[PDB]
Amino acid sequence: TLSIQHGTLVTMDQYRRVLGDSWVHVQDGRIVALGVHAESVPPPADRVIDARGKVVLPGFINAHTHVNQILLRGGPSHGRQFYDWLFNVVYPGQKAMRPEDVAVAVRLYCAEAVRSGITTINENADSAIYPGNIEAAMAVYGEVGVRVVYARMFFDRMDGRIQGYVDALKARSPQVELCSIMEETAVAKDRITALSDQYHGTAGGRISVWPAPATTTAVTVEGMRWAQAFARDRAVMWTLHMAESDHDERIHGMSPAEYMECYGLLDERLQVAHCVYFDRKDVRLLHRHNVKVASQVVSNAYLGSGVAPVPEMVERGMAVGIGTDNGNSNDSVNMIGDMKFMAHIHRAVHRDADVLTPEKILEMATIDGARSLGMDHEIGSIETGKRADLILLDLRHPQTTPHHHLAATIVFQAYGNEVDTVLIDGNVVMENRRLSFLPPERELAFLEEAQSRATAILQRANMVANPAWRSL
Amino acid sequence: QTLSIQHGTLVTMDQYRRVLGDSWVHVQDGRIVALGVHAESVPPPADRVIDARGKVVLPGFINAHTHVNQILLRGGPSHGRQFYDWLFNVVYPGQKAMRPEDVAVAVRLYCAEAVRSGITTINENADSAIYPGNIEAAMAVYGEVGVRVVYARMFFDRMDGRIQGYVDALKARSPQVELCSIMEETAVAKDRITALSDQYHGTAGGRISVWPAPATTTAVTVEGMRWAQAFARDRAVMWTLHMAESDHDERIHGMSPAEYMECYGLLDERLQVAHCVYFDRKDVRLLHRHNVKVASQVVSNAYLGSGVAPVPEMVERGMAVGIGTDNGNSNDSVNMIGDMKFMAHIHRAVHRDADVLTPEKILEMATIDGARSLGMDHEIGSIETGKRADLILLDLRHPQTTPHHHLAATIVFQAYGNEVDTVLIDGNVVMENRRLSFLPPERELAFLEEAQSRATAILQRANMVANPAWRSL
Amino acid sequence: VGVRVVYARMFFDRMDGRIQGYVDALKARSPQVELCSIMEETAVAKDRITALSDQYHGTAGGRISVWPAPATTTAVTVEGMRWAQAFARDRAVMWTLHMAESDHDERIHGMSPAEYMECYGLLDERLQVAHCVYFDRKDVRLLHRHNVKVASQVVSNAYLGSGVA
Ligand SMILES: [Fe+3]
Ligand SMILES: [Fe+3]
């Protein structure tokens, strides 16, 4: 049992209560009780965590990300439109990674993520097809203690239209191999079903498995319908990348949202990612079927895609979470940095300093994010009965001083290093910035290994790591 | 007295943009005296050696336009408001309620944040210099801290009567907060600024400079702007003005502020303009023609709902565009690395062009081009012989900055702003292993509590709401 | 007749001087038709509307109701709008105003009428606004936030060449 005491609790509960000098009691992975110190004595606990002078929040929820690609950041990944990045960087880089590289990628990602207060990660696994990768990744997620949705991507249909464009893009890095990860529909089903049977609900309920048809052009109608029915039969969600680029825009003369509507493929268990190339009608169609959304505001900028209509969706009460997207289209895994970006980009583009409140941005990173993953009954707020995914932030630093309104301070001032202590499913995963799965005496050597492995991955893939200085 | 920084990777920002692995820098009497590569040359003897092994050495970051004292108004009171709403309901009244002893604490807090993020030069646009005691309080702290400072003394000498019914409506949003005026007579502004320059310009070993700062083209007379212009020329400094930050500035007398200034011969190579959001192609051509310097406040232009300035166009014309963090309470951080990432992304998003500004270019804007925007590029902004020793040491051995191959990309797209370890300004160690010379670790927490209290009290005296009720929509 | 009727009594208590040279030009289209004024002093509008409400509100078997109706945000003072707002609250009715029907209404003092009303706390759940043609995304958000009611005059917005809300 664990008692967190004397903090300010930012509950994100139904009344958005903010409780000064208050406590939380945790038992068997759950929040069992809460109270105010002046009115009540906290129950006895095996241990007390002192949060005096600190702010307690629900853990941040990364609503859509791609983990293993983190080893491709730091030089190779920037300055390219989506498809250029995909074909010259992501596909070949992923392919050159071995299972032992994956294990290091995952631990590096989880170290950055937990340090920034992320406790749930929706991993869209585009490299699950390669032998050994699932097993390597899953062993590290389990050990680390993070809550993970492992959304297994598949592609079962050739999009032949885009080929002369692809060859031109490939000529930018001709020594880098063009890859294919297409699989037959029935093979994808069997592989995802077996993955779910083996890993879903493992690591004490912390790991889930979803089917992830990649896009409306890369997956057949049958494949998407299978994913849809699978989500329904197993009480999970299914997810798809929607309208991330201007070449996706026209699946057969209508938008991807329209196309899915025609086939009855929009439902309340679908979470779509991106939605940059969206019009009013598309928003209406998602709204009507209660589709969940993950917005990758930073990555949409990094890749030169654009700006999604998040304010419109939010004003319709839609469940919109925030994803950091790829470890190499951001290039950080920092929810607080992404929140600030979500606040500012929309203000700038609408010329409206009040287009999204910092409270609302904080909601997107917590309780609404949970809702976007279909997990809001279990996580995303500090409420009795929910899982004990909790973070303690210290605002006593120069950047976060002064602080009066907590959501404003967090969104507009915090850098992302203010998170001290992190609980996931009631287990202490970080304490005073010390990571339980990467102790301080191993941290530097681990980073050097990740650095070396990245350098080697890029050599095997024939990718340029450090292009010559260019001002224009 | 001498200092040797050894075994770092030097990101010089010099004329060839040299990046020198396992290299050294020798510092003497506030100046970079020599550099070299360890494998080809032995460093000169020095009184002390700073070991930068495994670290990256950069020129110090340059904050090309900011407002310091306002930092005590962040944390609740300042967000969610268009420029004029923010100005009249927050900034003016908040500043007015601050006493000199509050100003001293504001300045130290700002400098602590700034130095911790690698900022070594600050262009402080002082909008509260009119209040007795404020200059002296601020200057003593800047001096003690060791930071390089341009103190640009803002003035307003003309009523802009057009915007009054708009102002009253805006004031009704916070009716208990007092409307207040900082207008002065032209001649009084001139005398005050001249005296401030005579007393403080070149002080603190040359670290402190004084510029005149006519506020805007509507708040200052032609005569006031011409005086500022001539003053800059006679004293070999710059003058600065806020340009086209909002859609209500846009029309000084039926043309843009740039056109208006052109008409009166007020665009010249010693002018540094701030903002330039409401700018068209012609305005950019006019600034370009006269070699006007520009400070872009990309983050604040978003925060205040103003928009996005045409930075790519200016940069492609070779113009000197620096990056400013702007107000301590329209950002609301003082973090150059965070703002660089925002500069990189906002423009990519708006142009739908992932390559619209390279991370190298963004790093140039924060260093050598920033120096150029202040007219100080002969003295600072690059690691070159003869220039001042304003240098920062970054450690990239953290999760977020791993892996790292291309340094500018890593810094711009991965660094959070806490990776700066050690900071030199004018050759003096102002920060070492994150320990601040002017705010030692055993005083830090108590100082932050005092800033917090003083802020709470400032807001009470001004009748400003600190912590508005939770609002989702 | 037996119809259910809300009688929203319009008033105007403030001169909008800005639009006068425009008005004279318009008047020259029919110069023999006289230019009229229906302005009243604030206190007179209040007394008249109060007396009308006391006399007719709830009559004809509850079929007739009386609301105050400040005409627009440029033709009524802040004090007049606030009185209407409080009157609606005290008597459990609504108040109503014409909003942003034309491109010359658009700028009450350098912001939209919705913004102007928000500044003074004049958007609430008992307000019903009419028209909303010259409205942007921010205006819609402001109304939504305060649960303002809306009447849309789609045919008339066409007939008069205003546009489409
Ligand atoms: Fe994605
Ligand atoms: Fe400014």
mmCIF file with all atom_site columns, C-alpha atoms in Angstrom, chain A residues 168-273:
data_model
loop_
_atom_site.group_PDB
_atom_site.id
_atom_site.type_symbol
_atom_site.label_atom_id
_atom_site.label_alt_id
_atom_site.label_comp_id
_atom_site.label_asym_id
_atom_site.label_entity_id
_atom_site.label_seq_id
_atom_site.pdbx_PDB_ins_code
_atom_site.Cartn_x
_atom_site.Cartn_y
_atom_site.Cartn_z
_atom_site.occupancy
_atom_site.B_iso_or_equiv
_atom_site.pdbx_formal_charge
_atom_site.auth_seq_id
_atom_site.auth_comp_id
_atom_site.auth_asym_id
_atom_site.auth_atom_id
_atom_site.pdbx_PDB_model_num
ATOM 1   C CA . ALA A 1 168 ? 11.583  9.992   -57.596 1.00 0.00 ? 168 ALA A CA 1
ATOM 2   C CA . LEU A 1 169 ? 11.605  10.237  -53.776 1.00 0.00 ? 169 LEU A CA 1
ATOM 3   C CA . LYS A 1 170 ? 13.911  7.114   -53.626 1.00 0.00 ? 170 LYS A CA 1
ATOM 4   C CA . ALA A 1 171 ? 16.418  8.800   -55.944 1.00 0.00 ? 171 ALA A CA 1
ATOM 5   C CA . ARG A 1 172 ? 17.095  11.334  -53.118 1.00 0.00 ? 172 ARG A CA 1
ATOM 6   C CA . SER A 1 173 ? 18.856  8.443   -51.264 1.00 0.00 ? 173 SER A CA 1
ATOM 7   C CA . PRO A 1 174 ? 19.471  5.822   -54.010 1.00 0.00 ? 174 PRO A CA 1
ATOM 8   C CA . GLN A 1 175 ? 21.832  3.663   -51.915 1.00 0.00 ? 175 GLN A CA 1
ATOM 9   C CA . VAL A 1 176 ? 18.933  3.190   -49.363 1.00 0.00 ? 176 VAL A CA 1
ATOM 10  C CA . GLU A 1 177 ? 16.774  0.080   -50.157 1.00 0.00 ? 177 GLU A CA 1
ATOM 11  C CA . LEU A 1 178 ? 13.066  0.364   -51.031 1.00 0.00 ? 178 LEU A CA 1
ATOM 12  C CA . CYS A 1 179 ? 11.157  -2.057  -48.724 1.00 0.00 ? 179 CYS A CA 1
ATOM 13  C CA . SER A 1 180 ? 7.810   -3.820  -48.690 1.00 0.00 ? 180 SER A CA 1
ATOM 14  C CA . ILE A 1 181 ? 5.884   -4.969  -45.609 1.00 0.00 ? 181 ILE A CA 1
ATOM 15  C CA . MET A 1 182 ? 2.721   -6.109  -47.348 1.00 0.00 ? 182 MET A CA 1
ATOM 16  C CA . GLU A 1 183 ? 1.118   -9.278  -46.149 1.00 0.00 ? 183 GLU A CA 1
ATOM 17  C CA . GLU A 1 184 ? -1.777  -11.384 -47.291 1.00 0.00 ? 184 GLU A CA 1
ATOM 18  C CA . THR A 1 185 ? -4.987  -10.610 -45.478 1.00 0.00 ? 185 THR A CA 1
ATOM 19  C CA . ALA A 1 186 ? -5.329  -14.070 -43.910 1.00 0.00 ? 186 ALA A CA 1
ATOM 20  C CA . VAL A 1 187 ? -1.676  -14.002 -42.713 1.00 0.00 ? 187 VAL A CA 1
ATOM 21  C CA . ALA A 1 188 ? -2.162  -10.615 -41.036 1.00 0.00 ? 188 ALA A CA 1
ATOM 22  C CA . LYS A 1 189 ? -5.278  -11.898 -39.276 1.00 0.00 ? 189 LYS A CA 1
ATOM 23  C CA . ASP A 1 190 ? -3.550  -15.015 -37.955 1.00 0.00 ? 190 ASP A CA 1
ATOM 24  C CA . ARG A 1 191 ? -0.492  -13.121 -36.799 1.00 0.00 ? 191 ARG A CA 1
ATOM 25  C CA . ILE A 1 192 ? -2.507  -10.446 -34.998 1.00 0.00 ? 192 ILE A CA 1
ATOM 26  C CA . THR A 1 193 ? -4.883  -12.962 -33.455 1.00 0.00 ? 193 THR A CA 1
ATOM 27  C CA . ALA A 1 194 ? -1.931  -15.023 -32.120 1.00 0.00 ? 194 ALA A CA 1
ATOM 28  C CA . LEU A 1 195 ? -0.236  -11.859 -30.822 1.00 0.00 ? 195 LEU A CA 1
ATOM 29  C CA . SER A 1 196 ? -3.449  -10.931 -29.011 1.00 0.00 ? 196 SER A CA 1
ATOM 30  C CA . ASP A 1 197 ? -3.989  -14.432 -27.607 1.00 0.00 ? 197 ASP A CA 1
ATOM 31  C CA . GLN A 1 198 ? -0.422  -14.453 -26.275 1.00 0.00 ? 198 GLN A CA 1
ATOM 32  C CA . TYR A 1 199 ? 0.031   -10.840 -24.976 1.00 0.00 ? 199 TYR A CA 1
ATOM 33  C CA . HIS A 1 200 ? -3.302  -9.184  -24.401 1.00 0.00 ? 200 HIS A CA 1
ATOM 34  C CA . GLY A 1 201 ? -3.883  -8.622  -20.664 1.00 0.00 ? 201 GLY A CA 1
ATOM 35  C CA . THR A 1 202 ? -0.315  -9.701  -19.714 1.00 0.00 ? 202 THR A CA 1
ATOM 36  C CA . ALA A 1 203 ? 2.038   -7.821  -17.342 1.00 0.00 ? 203 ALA A CA 1
ATOM 37  C CA . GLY A 1 204 ? -0.741  -7.527  -14.738 1.00 0.00 ? 204 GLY A CA 1
ATOM 38  C CA . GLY A 1 205 ? -3.272  -6.111  -17.266 1.00 0.00 ? 205 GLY A CA 1
ATOM 39  C CA . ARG A 1 206 ? -0.796  -3.368  -18.375 1.00 0.00 ? 206 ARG A CA 1
ATOM 40  C CA . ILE A 1 207 ? -0.408  -4.621  -21.951 1.00 0.00 ? 207 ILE A CA 1
ATOM 41  C CA . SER A 1 208 ? -3.248  -4.580  -24.535 1.00 0.00 ? 208 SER A CA 1
ATOM 42  C CA . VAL A 1 209 ? -3.311  -5.555  -28.176 1.00 0.00 ? 209 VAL A CA 1
ATOM 43  C CA . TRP A 1 210 ? -5.288  -3.836  -30.966 1.00 0.00 ? 210 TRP A CA 1
ATOM 44  C CA . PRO A 1 211 ? -5.508  -4.355  -34.718 1.00 0.00 ? 211 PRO A CA 1
ATOM 45  C CA . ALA A 1 212 ? -4.256  -1.457  -36.759 1.00 0.00 ? 212 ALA A CA 1
ATOM 46  C CA . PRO A 1 213 ? -5.053  -1.346  -40.450 1.00 0.00 ? 213 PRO A CA 1
ATOM 47  C CA . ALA A 1 214 ? -2.542  1.198   -41.653 1.00 0.00 ? 214 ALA A CA 1
ATOM 48  C CA . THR A 1 215 ? -4.638  3.441   -43.932 1.00 0.00 ? 215 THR A CA 1
ATOM 49  C CA . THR A 1 216 ? -7.765  3.251   -46.163 1.00 0.00 ? 216 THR A CA 1
ATOM 50  C CA . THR A 1 217 ? -5.546  2.809   -49.298 1.00 0.00 ? 217 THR A CA 1
ATOM 51  C CA . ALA A 1 218 ? -3.161  0.246   -47.886 1.00 0.00 ? 218 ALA A CA 1
ATOM 52  C CA . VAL A 1 219 ? -5.840  -2.052  -46.494 1.00 0.00 ? 219 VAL A CA 1
ATOM 53  C CA . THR A 1 220 ? -8.715  -3.835  -48.190 1.00 0.00 ? 220 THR A CA 1
ATOM 54  C CA . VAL A 1 221 ? -12.312 -3.373  -47.164 1.00 0.00 ? 221 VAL A CA 1
ATOM 55  C CA . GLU A 1 222 ? -12.238 -6.953  -45.872 1.00 0.00 ? 222 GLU A CA 1
ATOM 56  C CA . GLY A 1 223 ? -9.180  -6.231  -43.720 1.00 0.00 ? 223 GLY A CA 1
ATOM 57  C CA . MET A 1 224 ? -10.709 -3.146  -42.202 1.00 0.00 ? 224 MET A CA 1
ATOM 58  C CA . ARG A 1 225 ? -13.985 -4.959  -41.532 1.00 0.00 ? 225 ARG A CA 1
ATOM 59  C CA . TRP A 1 226 ? -12.085 -7.764  -39.847 1.00 0.00 ? 226 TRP A CA 1
ATOM 60  C CA . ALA A 1 227 ? -10.271 -5.228  -37.604 1.00 0.00 ? 227 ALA A CA 1
ATOM 61  C CA . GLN A 1 228 ? -13.592 -3.596  -36.834 1.00 0.00 ? 228 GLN A CA 1
ATOM 62  C CA . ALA A 1 229 ? -15.289 -6.887  -35.858 1.00 0.00 ? 229 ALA A CA 1
ATOM 63  C CA . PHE A 1 230 ? -12.216 -7.969  -33.891 1.00 0.00 ? 230 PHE A CA 1
ATOM 64  C CA . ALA A 1 231 ? -12.343 -4.822  -31.770 1.00 0.00 ? 231 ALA A CA 1
ATOM 65  C CA . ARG A 1 232 ? -16.018 -5.371  -31.086 1.00 0.00 ? 232 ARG A CA 1
ATOM 66  C CA . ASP A 1 233 ? -15.670 -9.125  -30.226 1.00 0.00 ? 233 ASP A CA 1
ATOM 67  C CA . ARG A 1 234 ? -12.727 -8.529  -27.885 1.00 0.00 ? 234 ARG A CA 1
ATOM 68  C CA . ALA A 1 235 ? -13.905 -5.245  -26.352 1.00 0.00 ? 235 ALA A CA 1
ATOM 69  C CA . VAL A 1 236 ? -10.847 -3.312  -27.543 1.00 0.00 ? 236 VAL A CA 1
ATOM 70  C CA . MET A 1 237 ? -10.411 -0.575  -30.172 1.00 0.00 ? 237 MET A CA 1
ATOM 71  C CA . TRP A 1 238 ? -9.075  -0.528  -33.706 1.00 0.00 ? 238 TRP A CA 1
ATOM 72  C CA . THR A 1 239 ? -7.054  2.244   -35.219 1.00 0.00 ? 239 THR A CA 1
ATOM 73  C CA . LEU A 1 240 ? -6.120  3.688   -38.566 1.00 0.00 ? 240 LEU A CA 1
ATOM 74  C CA . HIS A 1 241 ? -4.041  6.605   -39.979 1.00 0.00 ? 241 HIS A CA 1
ATOM 75  C CA . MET A 1 242 ? -6.365  9.011   -41.675 1.00 0.00 ? 242 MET A CA 1
ATOM 76  C CA . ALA A 1 243 ? -5.621  11.848  -44.065 1.00 0.00 ? 243 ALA A CA 1
ATOM 77  C CA . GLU A 1 244 ? -2.058  12.585  -42.837 1.00 0.00 ? 244 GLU A CA 1
ATOM 78  C CA . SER A 1 245 ? -1.004  13.736  -46.383 1.00 0.00 ? 245 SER A CA 1
ATOM 79  C CA . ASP A 1 246 ? -2.409  15.361  -49.592 1.00 0.00 ? 246 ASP A CA 1
ATOM 80  C CA . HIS A 1 247 ? -1.802  12.117  -51.601 1.00 0.00 ? 247 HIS A CA 1
ATOM 81  C CA . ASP A 1 248 ? -4.025  10.092  -49.150 1.00 0.00 ? 248 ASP A CA 1
ATOM 82  C CA . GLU A 1 249 ? -6.834  12.619  -49.577 1.00 0.00 ? 249 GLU A CA 1
ATOM 83  C CA . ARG A 1 250 ? -8.355  10.741  -52.587 1.00 0.00 ? 250 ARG A CA 1
ATOM 84  C CA . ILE A 1 251 ? -9.129  7.084   -52.023 1.00 0.00 ? 251 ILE A CA 1
ATOM 85  C CA . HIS A 1 252 ? -11.383 6.613   -55.006 1.00 0.00 ? 252 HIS A CA 1
ATOM 86  C CA . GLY A 1 253 ? -12.717 10.197  -55.434 1.00 0.00 ? 253 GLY A CA 1
ATOM 87  C CA . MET A 1 254 ? -13.859 10.939  -51.894 1.00 0.00 ? 254 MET A CA 1
ATOM 88  C CA . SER A 1 255 ? -12.186 11.488  -48.573 1.00 0.00 ? 255 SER A CA 1
ATOM 89  C CA . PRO A 1 256 ? -11.076 8.580   -46.406 1.00 0.00 ? 256 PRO A CA 1
ATOM 90  C CA . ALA A 1 257 ? -13.808 9.439   -43.955 1.00 0.00 ? 257 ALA A CA 1
ATOM 91  C CA . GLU A 1 258 ? -16.409 9.339   -46.694 1.00 0.00 ? 258 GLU A CA 1
ATOM 92  C CA . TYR A 1 259 ? -14.992 6.081   -48.023 1.00 0.00 ? 259 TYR A CA 1
ATOM 93  C CA . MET A 1 260 ? -15.167 4.506   -44.615 1.00 0.00 ? 260 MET A CA 1
ATOM 94  C CA . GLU A 1 261 ? -18.721 5.814   -44.097 1.00 0.00 ? 261 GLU A CA 1
ATOM 95  C CA . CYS A 1 262 ? -19.819 4.160   -47.372 1.00 0.00 ? 262 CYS A CA 1
ATOM 96  C CA . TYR A 1 263 ? -18.643 0.808   -46.056 1.00 0.00 ? 263 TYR A CA 1
ATOM 97  C CA . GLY A 1 264 ? -19.951 1.232   -42.458 1.00 0.00 ? 264 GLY A CA 1
ATOM 98  C CA . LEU A 1 265 ? -16.364 1.464   -41.160 1.00 0.00 ? 265 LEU A CA 1
ATOM 99  C CA . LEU A 1 266 ? -16.845 4.449   -38.806 1.00 0.00 ? 266 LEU A CA 1
ATOM 100 C CA . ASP A 1 267 ? -17.799 3.362   -35.282 1.00 0.00 ? 267 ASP A CA 1
ATOM 101 C CA . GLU A 1 268 ? -17.244 4.202   -31.631 1.00 0.00 ? 268 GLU A CA 1
ATOM 102 C CA . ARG A 1 269 ? -14.354 1.748   -31.232 1.00 0.00 ? 269 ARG A CA 1
ATOM 103 C CA . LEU A 1 270 ? -12.339 3.344   -34.068 1.00 0.00 ? 270 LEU A CA 1
ATOM 104 C CA . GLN A 1 271 ? -9.521  5.716   -33.142 1.00 0.00 ? 271 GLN A CA 1
ATOM 105 C CA . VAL A 1 272 ? -8.213  7.635   -36.099 1.00 0.00 ? 272 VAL A CA 1
ATOM 106 C CA . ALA A 1 273 ? -4.861  9.334   -36.148 1.00 0.00 ? 273 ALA A CA 1
#
